[PDB]
Amino acid sequence: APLIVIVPSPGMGHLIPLVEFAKVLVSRFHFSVSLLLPTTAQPTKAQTTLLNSLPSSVSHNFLPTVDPAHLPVAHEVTISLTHAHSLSSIRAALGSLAQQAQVVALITDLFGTGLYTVARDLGIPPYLYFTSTAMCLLFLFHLPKLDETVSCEYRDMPEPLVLPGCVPLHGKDFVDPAQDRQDQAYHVLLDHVKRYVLAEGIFVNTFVDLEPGAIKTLQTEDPNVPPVYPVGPIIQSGLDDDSDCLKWLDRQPSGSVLFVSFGSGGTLSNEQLNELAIGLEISGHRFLWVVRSPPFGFLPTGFVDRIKDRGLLVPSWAPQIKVLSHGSTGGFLTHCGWNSTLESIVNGVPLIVWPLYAEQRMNAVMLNQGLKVALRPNASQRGLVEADEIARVVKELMDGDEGKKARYKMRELSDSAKRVTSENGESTKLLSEVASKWSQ
Ligand SMILES: O=c1ccn([C@@H]2O[C@H](COP(=O)(O)OP(=O)(O)O[C@H]3O[C@H](CO)[C@@H](O)[C@H](O)[C@H]3F)[C@@H](O)[C@H]2O)c(=O)[nH]1
Numbered sequence: 001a002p003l004i005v006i007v008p009s010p011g012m013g014h015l016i017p018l019v020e021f022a023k024v025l026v027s028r029f030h031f032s033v034s035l036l037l038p039t040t041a042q043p044t045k046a047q048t049t050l051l052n053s054l055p056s057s058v059s060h061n062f063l064p065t066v067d068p069a070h071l072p073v074a075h076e077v078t079i080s081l082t083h084a085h086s087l088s089s090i091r092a093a094l095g096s097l098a099q100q101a102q103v104v105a106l107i108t109d110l111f112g113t114g115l116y117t118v119a120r121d122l123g124i125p126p127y128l129y130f131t132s133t134a135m136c137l138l139f140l141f142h143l144p145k146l147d148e149t150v151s152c153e154y155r156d157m158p159e160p161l162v163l164p165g166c167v168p169l170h171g172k173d174f175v176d177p178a179q180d181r182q183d184q185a186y187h188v189l190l191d192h193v194k195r196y197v198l199a200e201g202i203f204v205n206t207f208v209d210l211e212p213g214a215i216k217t218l219q220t221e222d223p224n225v226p227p228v229y230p231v232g233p234i235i236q237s238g239l240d241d242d243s244d245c246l247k248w249l250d251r252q253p254s255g256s257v258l259f260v261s262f263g264s265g266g267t268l269s270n271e272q273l274n275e276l277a278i279g280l281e282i283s284g285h286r287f288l289w290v291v292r293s294p295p296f297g298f299l300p301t302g303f304v305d306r307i308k309d310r311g312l313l314v315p316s317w318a319p320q321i322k323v324l325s326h327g328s329t330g331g332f333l334t335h336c337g338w339n340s341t342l343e344s345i346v347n348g349v350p351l352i353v354w355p356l357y358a359e360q361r362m363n364a365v366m367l368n369q370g371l372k373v374a375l376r377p378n379a380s381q382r383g384l385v386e387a388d389e390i391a392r393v394v395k396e397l398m399d400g401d402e403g404k405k406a407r408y409k410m411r412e413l414s415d416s417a418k419r420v421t422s423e424n425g426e427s428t429k430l431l432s433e434v435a436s437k438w439s440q
């Protein structure tokens with residue numbers, strides 16, 4: 001069986017999507033997968049749980065530790081230097097796999113582009129698995145031209161960027177590493193983007209119906225850009241441990257529950273949690289809120305008790321796909337991470353977008369002004385979203401006209417998602433087309 005080698009950037013939001021692509025490759029086709037994981041530290045309990053739960057066709061190997069004493073900032077820079085200081089270990093690992101097996105492809109994420117020429121030299125075609133939007137991919141291919149054209153900090157550009165086929169995008173909403181052009185994170189992002197051109201091909205976790213403009217543009221605007229393969233949505237099945245969540249959702253009316261979840265990495269002040277609480281309470285709507293610390297002793301006096309009839313508080317973790325696919329679930333207050341967004345898209349659940357970091361501000365603008373499947377609260381001057389504003393937008397989503405229009409549009413995207421991933425769907429077919437070229 002041909003071997004595919006996958007090199008994830010260190011960190012769980014890099015590993016989980018590439019593990020998901022791995023599960024897809026080995027279920028749908030006759031391939032084995034070897035994950036080579038560069039690491040700043042010894043395996044986590046979280047990494048070992050995820051990795052030891054995979055089918056036997058997916059092996060894994062933590063590479064020799066890069067000494068964290070010999071890395072003197074932003075996570076983009078740390079990721080990049082981990083890849084660089086692991087180049088030798090990967091070349092060595094890759095050399096040995098290549099002689100003991102037929103290595104037909106290398107797959108990396110958007111920070112593994114240092115491996116592309118290494119893979120080419122060894123007769124292995126390298127692919128980029130882009131875990132965010134086609135719009136975000138287009139933004140990044142355009143960034144070097146933007147960097148020359150515009151000399152001010154992007155937030156100071158009073159006019160929006162209008163990429164062909166895409167919603168206008170103010171500079172304040174550009175990805176995080178583009179918000180300080182003096183930080184090294186900006187320079188590393190440009191270096192990696194400049195090498196996307198070295199990929200045999202770029203998989204994108206999206207589909208034609210979701211982003212027709214950015215995909216049309218990516219696939220026609222430039223010969224310089226490699227082939228681009230929309231093969232999504234690819235999402236976790238959610239058939240794993242856990243949780244009174246489902247028992248509780250069963251007692252609620254159809255489309256009546258607002259699921260509220262900022263991810264693992266999405267951190268809110270105690271002041272902002274307490275405004276969210278009062279806001280949920282005074283909305284009058286039913287909610288399931290994954291409450292992460294700023295058990296519920298820091299929450300507004302009396303709140304836990306006053307919402308016993310209409311809201312469930314869950315510490316730390318909920319079964320997201322099980323919640324989102326339940327008929328009680330009417331909405332999702334999310335930080336707009338792409339994997340959460342895709343889960344919500346395939347289950348027809350419309351959103352309130354509350355972006356926190358990475359490319360989330362760009363996802364919010366796409367979801368809110370482009371696809372019109374999301375509402376958005378307004379922050380006050382200091383950046384705090386006030387209880388009264390949370391209540392207003394919760395009511396708009398769960399019972400208002402804007403919510404009805406969003407729910408309708410999101411149910412249409414839901415139907416496209418099901419179609420494009422079915423036996424004869426555009427996404428199933430395209431990935432089969434690319435994989436079959438490896439099979440020989
Ligand atoms: O209580 C919980 C909370 C989450 N989950 C699951 O964790 C995943 C969350 O993915 P999400 O894209 O929202 O966050 P993250 O992993 O940081 O994504 C990064 O990478 C993304 C691109 O790959 C990027 O768009 C994003 O901004 C980054 F953060 C998703 O599979 C949920 O079902 C859960 O099961 N229970």
Ligand SMILES: Oc1ccc(/C=C/c2cc(O)cc(O)c2)cc1
Pocket residue numbers: 011013014075076131132136175176177358359
């Ligand atoms: O620890 C980290 C975990 C995840 C990330 C992701 C960064 C990122 C930046 C982009 O411009 C686009 C994108 O899709 C992702 C960065 C650090």
